[PDB]
Design an enzyme around this catalytic site. Structure first.
Site, PDB file in Angstrom:
ATOM      1  N   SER A 155       0.830  -1.188   0.000  1.00 27.27           N
ATOM      2  CA  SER A 155       0.000   0.000   0.000  1.00 27.27           C
ATOM      3  C   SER A 155       0.873   1.249   0.000  1.00 27.27           C
ATOM      4  O   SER A 155       2.058   1.214   0.346  1.00 27.27           O
ATOM      5  CB  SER A 155      -0.879   0.009   1.242  1.00 27.27           C
ATOM      6  OG  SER A 155      -1.914   0.961   1.104  1.00 27.27           O
ATOM      7  N   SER A 209      -4.753   2.657   4.570  1.00 24.56           N
ATOM      8  CA  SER A 209      -5.663   2.426   3.451  1.00 24.56           C
ATOM      9  C   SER A 209      -5.841   0.962   3.067  1.00 24.56           C
ATOM     10  O   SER A 209      -6.775   0.656   2.322  1.00 24.56           O
ATOM     11  CB  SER A 209      -5.216   3.208   2.220  1.00 24.56           C
ATOM     12  OG  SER A 209      -3.967   2.742   1.749  1.00 24.56           O
ATOM     13  N   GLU A 250      -0.352   7.473 -10.341  1.00 24.54           N
ATOM     14  CA  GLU A 250      -1.798   7.554 -10.183  1.00 24.54           C
ATOM     15  C   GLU A 250      -2.299   8.955  -9.842  1.00 24.54           C
ATOM     16  O   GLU A 250      -3.418   9.309 -10.231  1.00 24.54           O
ATOM     17  CB  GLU A 250      -2.205   6.600  -9.051  1.00 24.54           C
ATOM     18  CG  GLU A 250      -3.680   6.601  -8.655  1.00 24.54           C
ATOM     19  CD  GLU A 250      -4.559   5.796  -9.600  1.00 24.54           C
ATOM     20  OE1 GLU A 250      -4.014   5.183 -10.544  1.00 24.54           O
ATOM     21  OE2 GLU A 250      -5.799   5.763  -9.381  1.00 24.54           O
ATOM     22  N   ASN A 270      -2.789  10.198 -13.687  1.00 23.28           N
ATOM     23  CA  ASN A 270      -3.739  11.129 -13.082  1.00 23.28           C
ATOM     24  C   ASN A 270      -4.401  11.998 -14.136  1.00 23.28           C
ATOM     25  O   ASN A 270      -5.616  12.231 -14.086  1.00 23.28           O
ATOM     26  CB  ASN A 270      -3.051  12.025 -12.050  1.00 23.28           C
ATOM     27  CG  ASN A 270      -4.043  12.919 -11.315  1.00 23.28           C
ATOM     28  OD1 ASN A 270      -4.804  12.439 -10.463  1.00 23.28           O
ATOM     29  ND2 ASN A 270      -4.066  14.215 -11.656  1.00 23.28           N
ATOM     30  N   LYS A 329      -9.409   9.750 -15.750  1.00 22.50           N
ATOM     31  CA  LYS A 329      -8.994   9.619 -14.360  1.00 22.50           C
ATOM     32  C   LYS A 329      -9.314  10.914 -13.611  1.00 22.50           C
ATOM     33  O   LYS A 329     -10.237  10.940 -12.786  1.00 22.50           O
ATOM     34  CB  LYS A 329      -7.514   9.223 -14.270  1.00 22.50           C
ATOM     35  CG  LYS A 329      -7.087   8.615 -12.935  1.00 22.50           C
ATOM     36  CD  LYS A 329      -7.041   9.666 -11.814  1.00 22.50           C
ATOM     37  CE  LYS A 329      -6.507   9.081 -10.521  1.00 22.50           C
ATOM     38  NZ  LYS A 329      -6.265  10.145  -9.492  1.00 22.50           N
ATOM     39  N   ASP A 364     -12.359   9.941 -11.234  1.00 24.48           N
ATOM     40  CA  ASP A 364     -11.834   9.527  -9.935  1.00 24.48           C
ATOM     41  C   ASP A 364     -11.734  10.718  -8.981  1.00 24.48           C
ATOM     42  O   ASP A 364     -12.357  10.728  -7.913  1.00 24.48           O
ATOM     43  CB  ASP A 364     -10.465   8.883 -10.196  1.00 24.48           C
ATOM     44  CG  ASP A 364      -9.686   8.521  -8.929  1.00 24.48           C
ATOM     45  OD1 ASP A 364      -9.570   9.342  -7.991  1.00 24.48           O
ATOM     46  OD2 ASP A 364      -9.102   7.414  -8.908  1.00 24.48           O
ATOM     47  N   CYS A 398     -14.336  11.214  -4.967  1.00 25.72           N
ATOM     48  CA  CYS A 398     -14.435  11.939  -3.703  1.00 25.72           C
ATOM     49  C   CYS A 398     -15.871  12.301  -3.365  1.00 25.72           C
ATOM     50  O   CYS A 398     -16.238  12.297  -2.187  1.00 25.72           O
ATOM     51  CB  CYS A 398     -13.553  13.185  -3.736  1.00 25.72           C
ATOM     52  SG  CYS A 398     -11.802  12.763  -3.767  1.00 25.72           S
TER      53      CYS A 398
HETATM   54  N1  LIG Z   1      -7.983  10.820  -1.432  1.00 27.03           N
HETATM   55  C1  LIG Z   1      -8.214  10.518  -2.709  1.00 27.03           C
HETATM   56  O1  LIG Z   1      -8.805   9.485  -3.045  1.00 27.03           O
HETATM   57  C2  LIG Z   1      -7.591  11.383  -3.771  1.00 27.03           C
HETATM   58  C3  LIG Z   1      -8.068  11.334  -5.081  1.00 27.03           C
HETATM   59  C4  LIG Z   1      -7.484  12.119  -6.061  1.00 27.03           C
HETATM   60  C5  LIG Z   1      -6.449  12.958  -5.727  1.00 27.03           C
HETATM   61  N2  LIG Z   1      -6.040  13.033  -4.444  1.00 27.03           N
HETATM   62  C6  LIG Z   1      -5.055  14.060  -3.928  1.00 27.03           C
HETATM   63  O2  LIG Z   1      -5.769  15.216  -3.592  1.00 27.03           O
HETATM   64  C7  LIG Z   1      -4.914  16.372  -3.749  1.00 27.03           C
HETATM   65  C8  LIG Z   1      -5.580  17.389  -4.635  1.00 27.03           C
HETATM   66  O3  LIG Z   1      -5.642  16.819  -5.959  1.00 27.03           O
HETATM   67  P1  LIG Z   1      -6.390  17.601  -7.128  1.00 27.03           P
HETATM   68  O4  LIG Z   1      -6.388  16.702  -8.303  1.00 27.03           O
HETATM   69  O5  LIG Z   1      -7.674  18.154  -6.641  1.00 27.03           O
HETATM   70  O6  LIG Z   1      -5.361  18.803  -7.359  1.00 27.03           O
HETATM   71  P2  LIG Z   1      -5.711  20.227  -7.985  1.00 27.03           P
HETATM   72  O7  LIG Z   1      -4.421  20.892  -8.381  1.00 27.03           O
HETATM   73  O8  LIG Z   1      -6.719  20.059  -9.054  1.00 27.03           O
HETATM   74  O9  LIG Z   1      -6.405  21.044  -6.827  1.00 27.03           O
HETATM   75  C9  LIG Z   1      -5.729  21.480  -5.636  1.00 27.03           C
HETATM   76  C10 LIG Z   1      -6.293  22.845  -5.372  1.00 27.03           C
HETATM   77  O10 LIG Z   1      -5.808  23.326  -4.101  1.00 27.03           O
HETATM   78  C11 LIG Z   1      -5.686  24.726  -4.214  1.00 27.03           C
HETATM   79  N3  LIG Z   1      -4.846  25.209  -3.126  1.00 27.03           N
HETATM   80  C12 LIG Z   1      -3.489  25.075  -2.992  1.00 27.03           C
HETATM   81  N4  LIG Z   1      -3.003  25.617  -1.900  1.00 27.03           N
HETATM   82  C13 LIG Z   1      -4.121  26.147  -1.271  1.00 27.03           C
HETATM   83  C14 LIG Z   1      -4.283  26.848  -0.064  1.00 27.03           C
HETATM   84  N5  LIG Z   1      -3.263  27.208   0.723  1.00 27.03           N
HETATM   85  N6  LIG Z   1      -5.537  27.212   0.288  1.00 27.03           N
HETATM   86  C15 LIG Z   1      -6.551  26.898  -0.529  1.00 27.03           C
HETATM   87  N7  LIG Z   1      -6.519  26.249  -1.700  1.00 27.03           N
HETATM   88  C16 LIG Z   1      -5.265  25.899  -2.015  1.00 27.03           C
HETATM   89  C17 LIG Z   1      -5.101  24.937  -5.605  1.00 27.03           C
HETATM   90  O11 LIG Z   1      -5.279  26.274  -6.069  1.00 27.03           O
HETATM   91  C18 LIG Z   1      -5.886  23.894  -6.421  1.00 27.03           C
HETATM   92  O12 LIG Z   1      -6.995  24.445  -7.134  1.00 27.03           O
HETATM   93  C19 LIG Z   1      -3.579  15.838  -4.273  1.00 27.03           C
HETATM   94  O13 LIG Z   1      -2.724  15.632  -3.159  1.00 27.03           O
HETATM   95  C20 LIG Z   1      -3.980  14.506  -4.912  1.00 27.03           C
HETATM   96  O14 LIG Z   1      -2.893  13.590  -5.028  1.00 27.03           O
HETATM   97  C21 LIG Z   1      -6.582  12.277  -3.471  1.00 27.03           C
HETATM   98  N1  LIG Z   2     -10.673   2.250  -3.568  1.00 24.39           N
HETATM   99  C1  LIG Z   2      -9.466   2.698  -3.926  1.00 24.39           C
HETATM  100  N2  LIG Z   2      -8.517   1.793  -4.253  1.00 24.39           N
HETATM  101  C2  LIG Z   2      -7.329   2.228  -4.681  1.00 24.39           C
HETATM  102  N3  LIG Z   2      -6.914   3.484  -4.857  1.00 24.39           N
HETATM  103  C3  LIG Z   2      -7.873   4.361  -4.527  1.00 24.39           C
HETATM  104  C4  LIG Z   2      -9.133   4.064  -4.041  1.00 24.39           C
HETATM  105  N4  LIG Z   2      -9.836   5.227  -3.758  1.00 24.39           N
HETATM  106  C5  LIG Z   2      -9.004   6.184  -4.098  1.00 24.39           C
HETATM  107  N5  LIG Z   2      -7.809   5.733  -4.595  1.00 24.39           N
HETATM  108  C6  LIG Z   2      -6.713   6.506  -5.198  1.00 24.39           C
HETATM  109  O1  LIG Z   2      -5.919   7.092  -4.201  1.00 24.39           O
HETATM  110  C7  LIG Z   2      -5.202   8.177  -4.801  1.00 24.39           C
HETATM  111  C8  LIG Z   2      -4.664   9.076  -3.722  1.00 24.39           C
HETATM  112  O2  LIG Z   2      -3.483   8.515  -3.139  1.00 24.39           O
HETATM  113  C9  LIG Z   2      -6.201   8.812  -5.755  1.00 24.39           C
HETATM  114  O3  LIG Z   2      -5.521   9.339  -6.892  1.00 24.39           O
HETATM  115  C10 LIG Z   2      -7.114   7.636  -6.170  1.00 24.39           C
HETATM  116  O4  LIG Z   2      -6.984   7.230  -7.522  1.00 24.39           O
END
Ligand SMILES: NC(=O)c1ccc[n+]([C@@H]2O[C@H](COP(=O)([O-])OP(=O)(O)OC[C@H]3O[C@@H](n4cnc5c(N)ncnc54)[C@H](O)[C@@H]3O)[C@@H](O)[C@H]2O)c1
Ligand SMILES: Nc1ncnc2c1ncn2[C@@H]1O[C@H](CO)[C@@H](O)[C@H]1O
Ligand SMILES: NC(=O)c1ccc[n+]([C@@H]2O[C@H](COP(=O)([O-])OP(=O)(O)OC[C@H]3O[C@@H](n4cnc5c(N)ncnc54)[C@H](O)[C@@H]3O)[C@@H](O)[C@H]2O)c1
Ligand SMILES: Nc1ncnc2c1ncn2[C@@H]1O[C@H](CO)[C@@H](O)[C@H]1O
Ligand SMILES: [K+]
Ligand SMILES: [K+]
Lengths: 475, 475
Positions: free
Chosen positions: B85, B90, B200, B225, B230, B234, B239
């Site tokens: 992982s 996760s 990713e 990504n 994606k 995604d 989210c």
């Molecule tokens: N948890 C999940 O499943 C998952 C899924 C996809 C991506 N991610 C992660 O989520 C994060 C965001 O990804 P994204 O694709 O939305 O990126 P993105 O670049 O599209 O969006 C991030 C946003 O944050 C804003 N930002 C930056 N600093 C800021 C601050 N101080 N205050 C307010 N806004 C601010 C930017 O202007 C931008 O619009 C990344 O770390 C990515 O890897 C997580």
């Molecule tokens: N169910 C899941 N299995 C694997 N990866 C995931 C899952 N949900 C979110 N993620 C991935 O986790 C990444 C963040 O580390 C995102 O870009 C997304 O593609």
């Protein structure tokens, strides 16, 4: 439609519906200025510099209240402006009158014939002393088309005898042939002095790429449509406002509970679907692009082919920029009084010609731009704006606040085309200027931006003042 | 957490929580396969070719039920897979067990320590006979980071003596020191055989460009990504599903009527805001980017700085990929039991360290990954997942159907990296393949795609089978 032209010996030329509408137009312009902070602040920022000083500037773009604020911004920056509409139904006659009353050549009225439309385009391009524009603002590419066809026809006049089966191209050809007799070599005289065009809309940009690929583009172009602050705001939220507005004004039909078919799910289709969904319509979407189709599904819309919903939908809205979306055989199968309209391009998304020529059909004008077509079998459909842009033809188009995005982009594009050395090609504004367009609109909305700290700017590797996103970011 | 390793003399190595969960994991994998038509159809399409035959393939990516279907797709195409992982909370232990029961090395369990996390990364990268991966699937760039740091530290071992003020980098440095002692020259041995990484997530792609900007990237990278199918599915709709899911499971708090502060309005912030809005929360948004801020306004959200909602909001969600978004001085001012969580990256969007070290603070574990921090003045906040990815740490991450988009892209990216001769750089998949990912999901949704006529294809200047959009189209 009876028009007013300038008095003999007037300082400048114009042709509009009614100059007495000027006071009303000016009142709505004053209100619109307050709704267009990006445009008004750009007017102030560049005022001292006069970046467009003396530039002959022709615009072919819907002569609305919003365009009036654009015209006066360009004039405030020094430009010598002439204007026409880019659609026969989109002019707001009070806007046109207010701009003429301020001293500006305008050739535009609501309800032009196609012949009149192209005559107005020519009057706009023809500057005094047989000159032409040094810059063009274009929406849909018709002014750009006329300049290119006029130039190439001077080399090979036989193209003025091929209408390609198009009554409208025949109109353009006849006009250009007259200009070859009255002003031989005009297009070759003016093209070397025409330094660029800024193009407002998706279809116009497509036309520019057709020309650039064939090696036929004659001057640089700034693609305004694909500024983020245009395509993702005007095309989406503008249509969210102005599509339902036009449907309500034209028909007063309740949207709630009806099946509404939105054909296309690009930027305009996305905003159009939201426009109808907000009223409780059940929106069904057609698409050829599987990514856009999947987006529609993820928004909860059923994705269908038009034939699947001819017995269900009571509203059809084309958003494609493509031809032959609603065909005569579809309209033959539609529910009684189904509303048929187009928010995309020109008049060929719907087969309006085949509808008008359908054997035994009866046309009844309900009111201007609302026409009921009764088929011999007894069912009717209701066509809006003769299949031309419904938001501008049956309402007032997009509202001022979103047009401030589009028109701040237009203003910056005109400045850029004049000041910078562009080679032949199609360009977009830099991302930092695109961001500035958005930034200028936040204060009126009470939206407070957060500012990156030194540590955050280093962590992300971007400057505190932007640009904030990679070049390819999709928003 | 007490783990189970493979029996001595086993044909393959693993370390997981509990093999007895395998039957349950396999039942959920069977269900997920039906929800992942893109992955399953990609298996059928490439099955005869075996494009990944024998390829040593290491994955560092959330060990979920969805990743299990990815692993078995890569294996069905011939790959020799090892997996860990990319986050300490996760892993779904039943998914890990079902994959080990099928014969696959997995080093992952829910609730790893940081030391265990990096030990698992090493076990994944180290193939039998002191070999390394020929391809990497990475999510967040940790495996890529370790390969690069291992390679460069072999040239300059004093790199391993600079912890850079990071306890976690100290962990990585200590592990790399042991690998230099046990296997000198390992990283220089395996790097020439490592043909590429497919990344990713947004943060991992940012790390790839930072290495490219420094001229330090050692092998080609495929940016998964930024496939349209994606990033715009995604990151957004994933989210929208999994953020509220995690908040509900962790806290069972009603969202309706509460002010919820979403920090960031990129793809994740857009989906996160929708997740909360669907429950009647009043979402307020922070942003540094004026374009994204204006988008939030156009969606009807108030755009604020966090300091103006500390006395109002009861939920805070960081979505930025940036550091120091929720600071200790903010948490000192929050409403009682305000929920604080991060869906963006790592664990530094929230100042978790400063919170844990705040003078006089008391930490009460409500249940695993739900911690109440009670301040001396009596107010508390509720921190989810110790500030790590909340959707994966407190629920199950994104649902299978949307992960089928992401993981079909991953599968195609691995095939491409193996078959094509990429240079050193960061690449994306061609648009026609991106479109294919979406197309494969339409049948299960019942979506009916329209096919362009020959006349329409000519009118638009595109092929009936795509690609349908210009390279720069933003969807
Ligand atoms: N948890 C999940 O499943 C998952 C899924 C996809 C991506 N991610 C992660 O989520 C994060 C965001 O990804 P994204 O694709 O939305 O990126 P993105 O670049 O599209 O969006 C991030 C946003 O944050 C804003 N930002 C930056 N600093 C800021 C601050 N101080 N205050 C307010 N806004 C601010 C930017 O202007 C931008 O619009 C990344 O770390 C990515 O890897 C997580
Ligand atoms: N169910 C899941 N299995 C694997 N990866 C995931 C899952 N949900 C979110 N993620 C991935 O986790 C990444 C963040 O580390 C995102 O870009 C997304 O593609
Ligand atoms: N009326 C207005 O105020 C206004 C505003 C902006 C743009 N426009 C015009 O609207 C049109 C669309 O612009 P856009 O920015 O949305 O373009 P776009 O390329 O983003 O979207 C058009 C969509 O139509 C789809 N499509 C094409 N042929 C189709 C068919 N046969 N059936 C179903 N779907 C089909 C395409 O796949 C695409 O997704 C253009 O003509 C543009 O100039 C009008
Ligand atoms: N109120 C308006 N005034 C001027 N142009 C408009 C208005 N509403 C929409 N448009 C423009 O019309 C174009 C379509 O021809 C769109 O690209 C859009 O920018
Ligand atoms: K208007
Ligand atoms: K899941």
């Amino acid at each position: 439609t009876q028009t007013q032209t300038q008095p003999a010996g007037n300082a400048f030329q114009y042709e509009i519906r009614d100059i007495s509408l000027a006071e009303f137009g000016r009142k709505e312009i004053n209100l619109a200025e307050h709704e267009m902070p990006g445009l008004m602040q750009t007017r102030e920022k560049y005022g001292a510099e006069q970046p467009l000083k003396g530039v002959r500037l022709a615009g072919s773009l819907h002569m609305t209240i919003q365009t009036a604020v654009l015209i006066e911004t360009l004039q405030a920056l020094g430009a010598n402006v002439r204007w026409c509409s880019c659609n026969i139904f989109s002019t707001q006659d009070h806007a046109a009158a207010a701009i003429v009353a301020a001293g500006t050549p305008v050739f535009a009225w609501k309800g032009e014939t196609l012949e009149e439309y192209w005559e107005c385009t020519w009057k706009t391009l023809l500057f005094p002393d047989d000159m032409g524009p040094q810059l063009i603002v274009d929406d849909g590419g018709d002014a750009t088309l006329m300049v290119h066809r006029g130039f190439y026809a001077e080399d090979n006049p036989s193209i003025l005898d091929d209408d390609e089966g198009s009554e409208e191209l025949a109109i353009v050809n006849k006009l250009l042939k007259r200009i070859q007799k009255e002003k031989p070599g005009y297009w070759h005289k003016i093209v070397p002095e025409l330094k660029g065009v800024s193009e407002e809309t998706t279809t116009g940009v497509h036309r520019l790429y057709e020309m650039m690929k064939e090696g036929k583009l004659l001057f640089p172009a700034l693609n305004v449509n694909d500024s983020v602050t245009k395509s993702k705001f005007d095309n989406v939220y503008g249509c969210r406002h102005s599509l339902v507005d036009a449907i309500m004004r034209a028909t007063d039909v309740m949207l709630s509970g009806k099946v509404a078919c939105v054909l296309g799910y690009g930027d305009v289709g996305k905003g159009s679907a939201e426009s109808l969904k907000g009223q409780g319509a059940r929106v069904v979407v057609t698409e050829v692009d599987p990514i856009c189709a999947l987006q529609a599904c993820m928004a909860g819309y059923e994705v269908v082919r038009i034939e699947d919903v001819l017995d269900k939908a009571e509203i059809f809205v084309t958003t494609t920029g493509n031809c032959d979306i609603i065909r005569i055989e579809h309209m033959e199968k539609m529910r009684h009084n189904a509303i048929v309209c187009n928010i995309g391009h020109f008049d060929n998304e719907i087969q309006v010609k085949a509808l008008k020529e359908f054997p035994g059909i009866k046309r009844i004008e309900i009111k201007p731009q609302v026409d009921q077509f009764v088929f011999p079998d007894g069912h009717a459909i209701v066509l809006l704006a003769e299949g031309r842009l419904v938001n501008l033809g049956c309402a007032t188009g997009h509202p001022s606040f979103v047009m401030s995005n589009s028109f701040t982009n237009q203003t910056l594009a005109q400045i850029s085309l004049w000041k910078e050395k562009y080679e032949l090609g199609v360009y977009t504004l830099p991302k930092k200027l695109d961001e500035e367009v958005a930034r200028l609109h936040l204060e009126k909305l009470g939206a407070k931006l957060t500012v990156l700290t030194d540590k955050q700017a280093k962590y992300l590797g971007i400057a505190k003042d932007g640009p904030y996103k990679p070049d390819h970011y999709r928003y």
